Design an enzyme around this catalytic site. Sequence first.
Site, PDB file in Angstrom:
ATOM      1  N   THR A 150      52.349  48.425  31.005  1.00 60.13           N
ATOM      2  CA  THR A 150      51.818  48.313  30.256  1.00 60.13           C
ATOM      3  C   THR A 150      52.074  50.217  29.417  1.00 60.13           C
ATOM      4  O   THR A 150      51.447  50.325  28.231  1.00 60.13           O
ATOM      5  CB  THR A 150      50.213  48.015  30.234  1.00 60.13           C
ATOM      6  OG1 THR A 150      50.379  46.016  30.850  1.00 60.13           O
ATOM      7  CG2 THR A 150      49.429  47.923  29.397  1.00 60.13           C
ATOM      8  N   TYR A 171      51.115  41.651  24.163  1.00 60.47           N
ATOM      9  CA  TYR A 171      52.157  42.392  24.341  1.00 60.47           C
ATOM     10  C   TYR A 171      53.251  42.256  25.680  1.00 60.47           C
ATOM     11  O   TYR A 171      52.977  40.938  26.023  1.00 60.47           O
ATOM     12  CB  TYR A 171      51.795  44.259  24.615  1.00 60.47           C
ATOM     13  CG  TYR A 171      50.838  44.355  26.138  1.00 60.47           C
ATOM     14  CD1 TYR A 171      49.437  43.960  25.627  1.00 60.47           C
ATOM     15  CD2 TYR A 171      51.361  45.137  26.650  1.00 60.47           C
ATOM     16  CE1 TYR A 171      48.436  44.230  27.264  1.00 60.47           C
ATOM     17  CE2 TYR A 171      51.179  44.655  28.415  1.00 60.47           C
ATOM     18  CZ  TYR A 171      49.309  43.618  27.649  1.00 60.47           C
ATOM     19  OH  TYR A 171      48.256  44.092  29.343  1.00 60.47           O
ATOM     20  N   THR A 209      49.588  48.788  35.797  1.00 60.24           N
ATOM     21  CA  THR A 209      47.963  48.626  36.478  1.00 60.24           C
ATOM     22  C   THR A 209      47.782  47.486  36.919  1.00 60.24           C
ATOM     23  O   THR A 209      46.994  47.085  38.704  1.00 60.24           O
ATOM     24  CB  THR A 209      46.879  48.713  34.866  1.00 60.24           C
ATOM     25  OG1 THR A 209      46.989  47.426  34.410  1.00 60.24           O
ATOM     26  CG2 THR A 209      47.182  49.560  34.435  1.00 60.24           C
ATOM     27  N   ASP A 210      48.045  46.041  37.430  1.00 61.70           N
ATOM     28  CA  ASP A 210      48.237  45.262  38.145  1.00 61.70           C
ATOM     29  C   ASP A 210      48.229  45.008  39.405  1.00 61.70           C
ATOM     30  O   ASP A 210      47.458  44.303  40.246  1.00 61.70           O
ATOM     31  CB  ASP A 210      48.603  43.618  37.375  1.00 61.70           C
ATOM     32  CG  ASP A 210      48.868  43.161  36.024  1.00 61.70           C
ATOM     33  OD1 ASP A 210      47.376  44.285  35.924  1.00 61.70           O
ATOM     34  OD2 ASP A 210      49.504  42.724  35.953  1.00 61.70           O
ATOM     35  N   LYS A 213      41.676  47.368  40.969  1.00 61.54           N
ATOM     36  CA  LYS A 213      41.440  47.523  39.635  1.00 61.54           C
ATOM     37  C   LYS A 213      40.071  46.438  39.729  1.00 61.54           C
ATOM     38  O   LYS A 213      40.258  45.604  39.771  1.00 61.54           O
ATOM     39  CB  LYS A 213      42.686  46.327  38.804  1.00 61.54           C
ATOM     40  CG  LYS A 213      42.271  46.114  37.754  1.00 61.54           C
ATOM     41  CD  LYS A 213      43.944  45.914  36.935  1.00 61.54           C
ATOM     42  CE  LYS A 213      44.185  45.429  35.472  1.00 61.54           C
ATOM     43  NZ  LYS A 213      45.514  45.439  35.565  1.00 61.54           N
ATOM     44  N   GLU A 234      31.014  36.433  62.214  1.00 56.06           N
ATOM     45  CA  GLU A 234      30.650  34.870  62.748  1.00 56.06           C
ATOM     46  C   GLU A 234      31.861  34.727  63.321  1.00 56.06           C
ATOM     47  O   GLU A 234      31.552  33.704  63.918  1.00 56.06           O
ATOM     48  CB  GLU A 234      30.158  34.336  61.697  1.00 56.06           C
ATOM     49  CG  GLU A 234      29.383  34.260  60.518  1.00 56.06           C
ATOM     50  CD  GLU A 234      28.905  33.723  59.548  1.00 56.06           C
ATOM     51  OE1 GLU A 234      28.977  32.321  59.396  1.00 56.06           O
ATOM     52  OE2 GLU A 234      28.748  34.612  58.343  1.00 56.06           O
TER      53      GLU A 234
HETATM   54  N1  LIG Z   1      28.814  32.426  56.556  1.00 53.50           N
HETATM   55  C1  LIG Z   1      26.922  32.102  55.689  1.00 53.50           C
HETATM   56  C2  LIG Z   1      26.594  34.173  55.273  1.00 53.50           C
HETATM   57  C3  LIG Z   1      25.254  34.248  54.471  1.00 53.50           C
HETATM   58  O1  LIG Z   1      24.918  33.064  54.658  1.00 53.50           O
HETATM   59  O2  LIG Z   1      24.965  35.465  54.380  1.00 53.50           O
HETATM   60  C4  LIG Z   1      27.089  31.064  55.141  1.00 53.50           C
HETATM   61  O3  LIG Z   1      27.680  31.478  54.439  1.00 53.50           O
HETATM   62  O4  LIG Z   1      26.608  30.603  55.399  1.00 53.50           O
HETATM   63  N1  LIG Z   2      50.964  43.004  33.393  1.00 57.18           N
HETATM   64  C1  LIG Z   2      51.199  44.847  33.181  1.00 57.18           C
HETATM   65  C2  LIG Z   2      49.451  45.536  33.294  1.00 57.18           C
HETATM   66  C3  LIG Z   2      49.313  47.187  32.825  1.00 57.18           C
HETATM   67  O1  LIG Z   2      50.198  47.489  32.979  1.00 57.18           O
HETATM   68  O2  LIG Z   2      47.882  47.485  32.756  1.00 57.18           O
HETATM   69  C4  LIG Z   2      51.316  45.298  35.106  1.00 57.18           C
HETATM   70  O3  LIG Z   2      50.048  45.535  35.331  1.00 57.18           O
HETATM   71  O4  LIG Z   2      52.506  46.004  34.368  1.00 57.18           O
END
Ligand SMILES: N[C@@H](CC(=O)O)C(=O)O
Ligand SMILES: N[C@@H](CC(=O)O)C(=O)O
EC number: 3.5.1.1
Lengths: 326, 326, 326, 326
Positions: free
Chosen positions: A12, A25, A89-90, A162, A283
């Site tokens: 960009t 753009y 940026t992507d 980003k 876990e």
């Molecule tokens: N893996 C767990 C994480 C949590 O509870 O903090 C759950 O999502 O049940």
């Molecule tokens: N699509 C663009 C976005 C950016 O440059 O801000 C790119 O990553 O080239």
Amino acid sequence: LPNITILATGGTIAGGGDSATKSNYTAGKVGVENLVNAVPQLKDIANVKGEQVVNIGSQDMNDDVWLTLAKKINTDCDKTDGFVITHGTDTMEETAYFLDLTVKCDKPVVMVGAMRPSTSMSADGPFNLYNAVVTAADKASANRGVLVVMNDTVLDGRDVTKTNTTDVATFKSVNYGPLGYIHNGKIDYQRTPARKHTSDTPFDVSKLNELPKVGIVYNYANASDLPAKALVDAGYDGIVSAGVGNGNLYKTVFDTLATAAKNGTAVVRSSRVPTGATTQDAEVDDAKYGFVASGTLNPQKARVLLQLALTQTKDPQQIQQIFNQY
Amino acid sequence: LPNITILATGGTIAGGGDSATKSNYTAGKVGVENLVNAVPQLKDIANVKGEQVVNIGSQDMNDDVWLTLAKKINTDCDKTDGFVITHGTDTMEETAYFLDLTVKCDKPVVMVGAMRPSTSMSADGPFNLYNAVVTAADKASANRGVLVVMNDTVLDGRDVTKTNTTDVATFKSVNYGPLGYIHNGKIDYQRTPARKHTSDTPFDVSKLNELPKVGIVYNYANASDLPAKALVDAGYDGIVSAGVGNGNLYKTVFDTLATAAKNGTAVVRSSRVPTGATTQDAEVDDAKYGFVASGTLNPQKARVLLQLALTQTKDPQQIQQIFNQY
Amino acid sequence: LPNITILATGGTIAGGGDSATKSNYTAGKVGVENLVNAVPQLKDIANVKGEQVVNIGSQDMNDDVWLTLAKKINTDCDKTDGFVITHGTDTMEETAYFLDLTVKCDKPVVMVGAMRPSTSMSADGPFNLYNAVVTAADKASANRGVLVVMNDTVLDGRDVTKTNTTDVATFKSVNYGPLGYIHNGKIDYQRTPARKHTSDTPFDVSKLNELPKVGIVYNYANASDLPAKALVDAGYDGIVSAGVGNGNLYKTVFDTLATAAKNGTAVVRSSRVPTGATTQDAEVDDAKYGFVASGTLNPQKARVLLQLALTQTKDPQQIQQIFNQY
Amino acid sequence: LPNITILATGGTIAGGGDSATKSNYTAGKVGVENLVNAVPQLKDIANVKGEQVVNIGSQDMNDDVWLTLAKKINTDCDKTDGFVITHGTDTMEETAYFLDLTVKCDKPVVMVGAMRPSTSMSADGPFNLYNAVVTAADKASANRGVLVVMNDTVLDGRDVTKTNTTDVATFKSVNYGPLGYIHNGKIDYQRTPARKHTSDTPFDVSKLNELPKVGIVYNYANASDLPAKALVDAGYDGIVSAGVGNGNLYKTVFDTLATAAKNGTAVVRSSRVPTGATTQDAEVDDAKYGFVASGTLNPQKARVLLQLALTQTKDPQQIQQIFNQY
Ligand SMILES: N[C@@H](CC(=O)O)C(=O)O
Ligand SMILES: N[C@@H](CC(=O)O)C(=O)O
Ligand SMILES: N[C@@H](CC(=O)O)C(=O)O
Ligand SMILES: N[C@@H](CC(=O)O)C(=O)O
């Protein structure tokens, strides 16, 4: 004046809108000689040489551009005081980390882009590019690995991500913070990354023509295993899981990946969660399944280190130590 | 005192550590009468009734648990003054948003979890659960939609997301902010969601036993289009793209989803980026390809609204309307 | 197109930089008639009338500019569809809140500034002003109180604060978040402040030519009580403590202020801490001493509400009620 | 096991109220033996010796406690493997930076508090204390300066600040980020402060019984000059201005401090604004007035470095060189 090479890849910052207040753009439209001449003040702080490497939106960034860029920088390291890479940026955070692990040059390598098209009111590209050149010209920027300079902030390629879809201030190092801030062309550097980078890594892509195939699968409630199964049927070398929370996998994705790992697919557990580490000792018993925890690397960056890990080794125990040192 | 029904579904709040100093644990293995008795102060603020709906880690959360939860709250609405759902933190944000669209009870429905296991040294669960019940029993909590109460903060189910893998303070409403802060059992509510929730949505799952199939594909540099291809070959109703930047797609994922969209797969452009809207009027002409822009909904939340939108319409123009109102 | 009045007060958006590579400059130089000329695009969204009401650096902002600004808006309300106030960024958050309390016009009142000088590369001012006028011209911006539009974000005047010293993204509503985001001249409003503002306040400055005297004392290790002593001796109507942590006071500052409260000085406990409420029921027994807790109001903003409270009541219990409602 | 000395000074970590559920409490109530006995797991990682230096709320911290703490650490450095200082959160960031500059011991010195009193439900103190002791006992913690360990995070004493009045996650290094994160008693350190601390500072308090007198004045709209006059009239060695924006001063405060600096008072320009640097080469011509710019030091931390600076020199030019190095 220092000699600075600008390697232009598009984005960009090379981005071209229909008007100044309308958000439509195309990335990667403007050439490098037009980027430089738009900022005449560049010529008073650096001897600038431009090359156009490609002109794509970074949404289309790929292995071939990455390999080209690492080889170019490694090759021209001796012929220049510092590099600036203009980039979308992507996927800037992905290229920054890839170059962070592959560049053998410890001259400043700075990546820069823009969130607003060059044709818009209050276009951020010009000042970003100026500050990117300022950063690449500073001796203090040397030996800090590949740097991303956006919104007056110097960020390391490892932690930079980003964080926002549209903000000029989108780039942050969400775990460990920035290296420095730029005010009036002076950089207050108070940090340097501790993980090894550039010349201190064993990864060398100079002879490589392709990289190992690493895919990313997303986890979410009721997650489909079809994506994981499609990458394994296609013989992918590695799969990164964008886990829920601390790298946890939906049951059917867990089964598919646990199996693929026994059959020697490298599996890294990362997280869709934007900040913090996917740790060991939570876990998931990684030792049992042959899974690697990504630590603070997010899925797209985990992909980067797994690709390069898989050029040295297919051993999960060794990929884990790679993930603990780079 | 108000009657508060606690519906337990598992998670780390019902999570059991190997020890107190040690971070290793299993989610969803303590029953609901054990959670209540573990916090006797609840008996002085509410008439608490507990039911165990399921006991899973929320990494295994799925469509069946969702339909069951919605059906149970809608059936029991006139039997209680408030619901507290105990839930794992991993997919809490997905469950909260589903219930935010499908619950027709405008009594407080509050979701709560814990980032540390009950056996851990400064377990967040007891205080979270107390504050969730406080919140569920405040008359001011009514008509705000489904709430998540974590770390002394009341978050709306639409914007709340897990921002950190391990931090007790992980849940944040990253685009629009919290609804209120709890101190000494009092809630300073300064916000209410503007988007239509609960009883103002057309979504009714009361006679549904299955939901439309929606999968999520991840975008990155060199992204495979196989994950996307697998989901269209399996006849998924809908695909959410976790795109790069403002909802952008990798070349081949683009080509694959653009064909899927014109053959009647619902395609939603979301973003891997943790904050901000996937907007219309950027780099993708959504009108030409029949793509929907998710706005501030992250991929896993966009999936929830797409699943529901597909019970009423398969017209992309109408699905975009839904994404602009819910 | 709607009728929008720009009231200029000065700031960095008029702040003429020394140049493009230079952040050294003076705030306040250029004038309303040549704002619409630097931003021709304003003419496509609004019928713009500009008046200069003063021309200062907002570090010199004072009671007199506040009263004239409020009387101006109150008088001209019926002559326009909306107001934009160009303002220095340093005390924007104070003026914004002052107006939020005293303006009786429920048409959009939008404050805007610039962090970069008008001469800078990538100057933020122009797009900020464009977006401020879009916000003023949108009828959905009505009845949300006074707005601050910076960096593509609509922020409410009560919660907005300057969080960074230099960043263009500095303005955040750090407790409850923004009201909306602007993309391509369209605002996605998902919030409105619950606290009472403009028409719903009892504060009327229509006949006031002067405001109560309210100063601010800072707390820190080994804090001197002399600042507090000096304002009490000078007969200040009100003292705002920027306390440490949860509005706590150094012993000798606590002492001076407990005495002042007893001799009828209004004392408001606030916090130097940038986010979160200064609460009742912590370490300070406010009922005992005659103190008021500021809630989420930071010292400066709490000064604004205390000044206005002191025009109606000198009763701590009543000032506390005011602090819990505005 | 290593020898860890806990020097106790008080705070909410040693605080109790009447209730697990009610927020009211007194800081600095519990002795150090009761804190250590509350965490038996300490005995498995360190040989802990506790000494009570004082039992105060850190709102009451003062230069005498600072000098006592610096002397104790310096004198007992060789007798132990590391120090943990239990401290109130309110002025922790001030003490931590005082010690960061004055401690000559390069063994881990770790400070730790709690945001909830020890009697609270889900009290944070126990696990914070466990993690501060894990940090002090880790050899990787040596040579990083004085550390604050809170909410699983290792924070450098220079950049750390309290960002929230109530949140357990309040402590952030808002400019440069944290040094490390603790998971399962293991620290992932990826940063070290680059500014000189402990044994590389010239500051030595070993022979001092007093520190120069430095006060802080706050800037806002219509700011009174009486606070600044009152410190000048009392013959204060130093004044730190909590400026608006990039360290700017209200006109009357500017005049009083310009006057004061002319007459030999050291004047440091800092900012009320929580993040970013108070820079030179902004709107205040510091050279003309003899003002020092704080950089990223907030008011209360600029006071610390100015107090120590004033023990070596009174030359603004040299005090500025200190603010650029420490
Ligand atoms: N893996 C767990 C994480 C949590 O509870 O903090 C759950 O999502 O049940
Ligand atoms: N699509 C663009 C976005 C950016 O440059 O801000 C790119 O990553 O080239
Ligand atoms: N010093 C300026 C700051 C700005 O506008 O950016 C002012 O407040 O007038
Ligand atoms: N007032 C207490 C607050 C805390 O420790 O959290 C102190 O600083 O001692």
